[PDB]
């Protein structure tokens, strides 16, 4: 309720290394983990390089891509607040779709149910990789421009004729951790394979 100019807040931020800055706006919208991803920071991102590399040698890139997507969406939110989504192109539209999916699937957690009571690192990194792979493949597809339209036409094509993958992506948060890592990992690998089938099957008939 008070800005960072508060002397206690400034003193803490002058020393504290990781700031999980919860925003009251997210609390109004009933987003329960409520961490504002624009203002939070973690100066430990460099020391954790070894652990991230050994766990999954491609997590850093997907995390950076997710950060870029979130920042781009927050950037053009002001432009949409003025003009509207009418001028939004294929890239912007797919970026906002992925940002909304990330916001409601990844960044949320109920914590009052076994779906989100405790998310292990493997499940979280698999969700991130799935979402980022979907974003990258969709961007490549709309950049292909096959069928003389491509673009937002291809975006609608993948949101309608390929929306089952989208629904499975947005429901991936419900993978029960009690099933164990060898089961959830297999399920997410299958979902990744199905996503790779899309944007290639969609490109088969040139949209």
């Amino acid at each position: 309720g008070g800005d960072f100019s508060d002397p206690v807040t400034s003193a803490t931020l002058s020393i504290v290394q990781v700031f999980w800055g919860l925003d009251k706006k997210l609390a109004q919208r009933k987003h329960f983990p409520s961490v504002n991803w624009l203002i939070s920071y973690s100066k430990y991102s460099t020391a954790l390089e070894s652990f991230y590399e050994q766990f999954d040698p491609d997590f850093i890139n997907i995390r950076t891509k997710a950060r870029e997507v979130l920042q781009r969406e927050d950037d053009l939110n002001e432009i949409v607040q003025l003009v509207g989504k009418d001028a939004l192109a294929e890239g912007d539209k797919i970026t906002l779709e992925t940002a909304k999916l990330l916001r409601e699937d990844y960044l949320a957690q109920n914590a009052f149910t076994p779906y989100d009571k405790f998310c292990p690192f493997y499940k979280s990194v698999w969700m991130m990789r799935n979402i980022i792979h979907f974003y990258n493949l969709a961007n490549q597809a709309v950049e292909k421009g096959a069928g003389m339209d491509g673009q937002k036409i291809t975006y609608t094509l993948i949101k309608h004729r390929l929306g089952d993958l989208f629904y499975r992506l947005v429901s991936q948060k419900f993978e029960d951790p009690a099933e164990g890592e060898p089961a959830l990992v297999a399920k997410f690998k299958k979902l990744h394979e199905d996503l790779t089938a899309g944007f290639r099957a969609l490109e088969d008939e040139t949209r």
Partner: protein
């Protein structure tokens, strides 16, 4: 604590709560010990407000139950810094050592902050925010933390200290500290009063920390938390949509935008408004809330789980 500003009917809604407060468990609840034995402590109140509360308590048939400690505005200022303490001591003796559920209505805590300011200034002490004493937080903690059930006794103490923001804000030291200490905040907004809704309670600023404990399948409908969390989200998003449409025009709005605006209208009119003498059963309130929610399609109801949807989306 009910947060209010000058002119809003905080006293009226306090009296309504005093007249209507009661147990909810399975709708089953003589109950003389269940009678809340309200202890009303008024500090710095215009004589009209004191007469109003007196007449309301007399008319509601509770004159053999309630108790009034009054410190009127014309009465000496210093007694305002003792009256709530006396009220809380009396409540503690009536509840813990006598086994009666007790309800307390402290009135105009800003009129207590004023007494603190006067005493601190008269002693030439170091001031704090806006010149208030540096230990106002300690005094407010001492005056609020004296309520709550106790394991060894069957009694209880539940207090509703109403508060008046000076310039209708929250950054003021007294409402700020009260929000820090107290486990809740009910907000009465001038915007709702200007639109002529008798309970002007703005449901978006509102908050109760112990809300997740009072509700539950053992004492409420299983969908209560879902219902609340959805109405809150739709109201907040619809308010954002209305703010956007205020500049982009009613024509630029989409179908979902129109649904959100209609939800806002029916929520602020049919739902929030209630009779000055008519209550609402919790299940009736949930039915009204479900009628409000069912405007949107099943897809848009993201917060509500499908299990509760199947038992309630049709009814």
């Amino acid at each position: 604590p009910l947060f209010s500003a000058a002119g809003l009917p905080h006293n009226e809604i306090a009296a309504q709560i005093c007249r209507q407060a009661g147990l909810v468990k399975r709708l089953e609840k003589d109950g003389e010990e269940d009678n809340f034995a309200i202890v009303f402590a008024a500090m710095g109140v215009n004589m009209e407000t004191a007469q109003f509360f007196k007449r309301d308590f007399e008319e509601n048939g509770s004159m053999e139950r309630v108790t009034l400690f009054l410190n009127l505005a014309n009465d000496p200022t210093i007694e305002r810094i003792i009256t709530p303490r006396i009220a809380l001591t009396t409540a503690e003796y009536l509840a813990y050592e006598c086994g009666k559920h007790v309800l307390v209505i402290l009135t105009d805590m800003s009129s207590y902050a004023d007494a603190l300011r006067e005493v601190s200034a008269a002693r030439e002490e170091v001031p704090g925010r806006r010149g208030y004493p540096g230990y106002m937080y300690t005094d407010l903690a001492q005056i609020y933390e004296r309520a709550g059930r106790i394991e060894g006794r069957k009694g209880s103490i539940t207090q509703i200290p109403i508060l008046t923001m000076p310039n209708d804000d929250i950054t003021h030291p007294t409402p700020d500290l009260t929000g820090y200490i107290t486990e809740g905040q009910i907000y009465i907004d001038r915007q709702l009063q200007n639109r002529q809704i008798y309970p002007p309670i703005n449901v978006l600023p509102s908050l109760s920390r112990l809300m997740k404990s009072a509700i539950g399948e053992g004492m409420t409908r299983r969908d209560h938390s879902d219902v609340s969390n959805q109405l809150y989200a739709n109201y907040a998003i619809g308010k954002d949509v209305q703010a956007m449409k205020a500049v982009v025009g009613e024509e630029a709005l989409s179908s979902e935008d129109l649904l959100y605006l209609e939800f806002l209208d029916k929520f602020e009119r049919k739902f929030v408004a209630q009779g000055a003498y008519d209550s609402r059963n919790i299940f009736q309130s949930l039915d009204l809330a479900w009628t409000l929610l069912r405007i949107f399609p099943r897809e848009l109801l993201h917060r509500i789980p499908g299990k509760t949807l199947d038992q309630y989306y049709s009814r």
